[PDB]
């Protein structure tokens, strides 16, 4: 047990009268009062948990060495993927440690870059007009996610007066007349609501004319009967059709409404009246499948869909004859079609995920015929933003040992052969001393689970190495082995082995992989992660007390469920912003959007599966189980912010209180010696560095792993 300085756990009050009935099952909730973040008693708790946490971290002598290495390894120039508008190319750049990326512009491909906007004096949703004369961007005013959109002129970097409030994730979609754009804002604030405490409902699709106030924007769609339905939108590369996509919750499923802009007399000004919604052709009007438009030749559209294709495919339909849908690129029986991109007037780039590695195909657009195939090494290719009219395609490659390469491919003039456009370099790190491999590991039920393992070349499998394992396992999210500077520090200066596990609930083998780890089958996700740890131990990478596990949000749920079920297997656990009360999550902020993956304790069958793994309801003293008297919980750090509208911090607080009660303060001479603490952020690159240095310092101490120069 790494930690020797004894622990003074603070008193935490239990309300023994709070009890709820779930279909005849009585569940006590003695920390109900921790659900209010503003009360005197909750603020005292925060203060008491901060004092305990600081005292344990002061014993962790490698925090400072970690912090300086992270800073040094992350301090290198980085280029984003370039995109084209008119004859200008745009990209982001960071020298290394700038708090935000700087936005650059150049005249030709061989042109000299100039600074167009430097925020270093938070910013998302950058979108350049068709003629390259304007750009729209979002500023973050608060602690909440709300964004304000402003527009600049690229010629002199001057602002327009236009200010658009109440945007979240919707970028500006510009019409080809350069007069304005479509976007999807939430309504203005009403009586009784407050900027801090407003919900995000009743989303709208609007058109904004440049040089006007938000209150003049044309209303194209809203639905007051279905307040939770949310929106994304798009315009076709030819400029003729506005596409509106309507979604419900977390599912990979959407509606598709199409508006023919060429049929409107006097453009978007026709709707000045409201008459409240525009005359959309409602091509798809249910939530049965995912649809994303890839191209159109007049009224003939190509779409990517999961309709009777859990690995996805490309289909074609004529809007003038919408009963008839025809396969263009058939579903593969082994590989997921992750994305598709129309390029160079008549070509398609398809990005496949094949045993959790990318493969790129280049095809003919009209026929679907295969022209070239490029398998990619262990890592991830992403960010293809080229449009159909563009002849140069760019994308980014990243991996555990590759900080970032941007590749360039002139499909017109010098085709087939990827040239490096920019390559990032980690300073003072010899990449050739390390390697990454993939193995497939059997889960409890026999299913094979792919995991990646990164380690120093030529190590002995003698059980001696500290090991960190990461996973997520939900929502159809594909977990790729990308670059992290702090992970390099763990590998080099702690002698570590890193493992990424592609457990079920992800999307890696399509929709069947997602469904085998959601709702009634969520327990499969935990079993998959436990199996991976058992493999790392039996194959001789590490041992039980030298395994750390880490994850965030749904990944934090992952960590907490796994330590409740198999505490013997782990020496350290770090849960960042986890969903910990699975009976009550849907009651707070936007947690109601996660019922599609988790179920909801409102329905009796869904309760019965939730109660078995809910973290705050399954904390149990491992030493009281008759064969494992020598087991305790791993040293545990729960990470959160004291205020967080994404995953409310009551989740973390209630768990922390439950663990400290059950394992430490309910009994007189507890075998639990490993510390159970929270690292609480009150209220940016340097903030993030300090969080990660704390977590790795605590990890080194807990696993009794010394520093190596």
């Amino acid at each position: 047990s790494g930690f020797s300085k004894p622990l003074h756990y603070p008193p935490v009050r239990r309300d023994e009268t709070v009890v709820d009935d779930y279909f005849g099952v009585k569940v006590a909730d003695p920390y109900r009062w921790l659900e209010d973040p503003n009360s005197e008693e909750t603020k005292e708790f925060v203060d008491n948990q901060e004092k305990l946490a600081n005292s344990v971290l002061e014993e962790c002598e490698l925090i400072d060495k970690f912090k300086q290495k992270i800073i040094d390894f992350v301090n290198f120039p980085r280029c984003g993927v370039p995109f084209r508008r008119a004859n200008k190319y745009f990209h982001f750049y960071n020298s290394g440690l700038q708090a935000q990326n700087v936005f650059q512009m150049q005249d030709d491909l061989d042109g000299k870059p100039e600074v167009l906007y430097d925020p270093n004096l938070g910013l998302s949703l950058y979108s350049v007009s068709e003629d390259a004369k304007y750009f729209a961007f979002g500023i973050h005013s608060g602690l909440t996610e709300w964004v304000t959109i402003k527009i600049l002129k690229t010629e002199d970097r001057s602002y327009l007066p236009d200010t658009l409030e109440w945007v979240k994730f919707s970028p500006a979609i510009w019409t080809h007349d350069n007069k304005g754009f479509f976007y999807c804002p939430y309504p203005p604030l009403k009586e009784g609501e407050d900027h801090m405490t407003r919900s995000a409902v009743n989303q709208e699709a609007r058109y904004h004319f440049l040089g006007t106030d938000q209150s003049e924007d044309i209303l194209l769609w809203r639905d007051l009967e279905n307040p939770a339905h949310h929106l994304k939108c798009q315009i076709t590369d030819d400029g003729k059709y506005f596409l509106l996509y309507i979604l419900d919750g977390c599912d990979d499923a959407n509606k598709v409404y199409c508006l023919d802009l060429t049929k409107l007399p006097n453009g978007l000004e026709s709707f000045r009246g409201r008459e409240d919604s525009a005359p959309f052709m409602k091509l798809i009007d249910s939530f049965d499948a995912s649809y994303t438009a890839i191209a159109n030749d007049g009224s003939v559209f190509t779409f990517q869909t999961n309709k009777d294709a859990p690995r996805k495919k490309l289909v074609r339909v004529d809007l003038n004859n919408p009963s008839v849908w025809t396969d263009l690129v058939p579903e593969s029986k082994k590989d997921l079609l992750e994305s598709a991109h129309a390029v160079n007037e008549n070509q398609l780039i398809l990005r496949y995920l094949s045993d959790v590695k990318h493969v790129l195909e280049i095809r003919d657009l009209e026929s679907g015929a295969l022209q070239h195939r490029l398998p990619i090494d262990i890592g991830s290719v992403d960010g293809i933003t080229a449009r159909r009219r563009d002849s140069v395609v760019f994308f980014k490659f990243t991996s555990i040992l590759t900080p970032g390469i941007v590749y360039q491919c002139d499909l017109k003039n010098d085709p087939t052969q990827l040239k490096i456009f920019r390559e990032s370099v980690v300073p003072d790190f010899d990449r050739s001393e390390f390697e990454v491999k993939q193995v497939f590991v059997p889960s409890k039920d026999g299913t094979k689970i792919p995991i990646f393992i990164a380690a120093r070349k030529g190590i002995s499998l003698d059980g001696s190495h500290p090991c960190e394992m990461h996973g997520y396992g939900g929502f159809g999210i594909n977990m790729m082995p990308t670059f992290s500077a702090s992970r390099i520090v763990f590998l080099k200066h702690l002698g570590g082995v890193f493992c990424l596990a592609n457990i079920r609930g992800g999307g890696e083998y399509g929709e069947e992989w997602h469904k085998a780890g959601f709702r009634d089958k969520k327990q499969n996700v935990f079993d998959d992660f436990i199996s991976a740890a058992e493999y790392l131990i039996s194959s001789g990478y590490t041992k039980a007390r030298r395994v750390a596990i880490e994850g965030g949000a749904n990944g934090g749920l992952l960590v907490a469920a796994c330590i409740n079920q198999r505490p013997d297997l782990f020496g350290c656990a770090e849960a960042n912003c986890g969903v910990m009360d699975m009976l009550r999550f849907h009651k707070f902020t936007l947690g109601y959007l996660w019922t599609g993956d988790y179920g909801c304790s409102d329905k009796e069958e869904e309760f019965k599966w939730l109660i078995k793994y809910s973290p705050i309801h399954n904390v149990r003293r491992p030493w009281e189980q008759p064969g494992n008297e020598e087991t305790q919980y791993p040293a545990t750090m729960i990470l959160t912010a004291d205020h967080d509208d994404r995953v409310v911090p009551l989740h973390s607080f209630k768990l922390l209180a439950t663990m400290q009660h059950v394992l430490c303060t309910s009994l007189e001479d507890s075998p639990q010696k490993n510390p159970i603490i929270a690292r609480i952020q009150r209220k940016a690159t340097m903030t993030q560095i300090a969080e990660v240095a704390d977590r790795y310092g605590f990890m080194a101490k807990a696993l009794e792993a010394p520093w190596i120069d």
């Binding site: 992350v74 980085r78 984003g80 995109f83 440690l97 990326n101 990308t482 690159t685």
Partner: peptide
């Protein structure tokens, strides 16, 4: 495109 720092 506009990526946070890979900490």
């Amino acid at each position: 495109e506009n990526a946070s720092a890979p900490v």
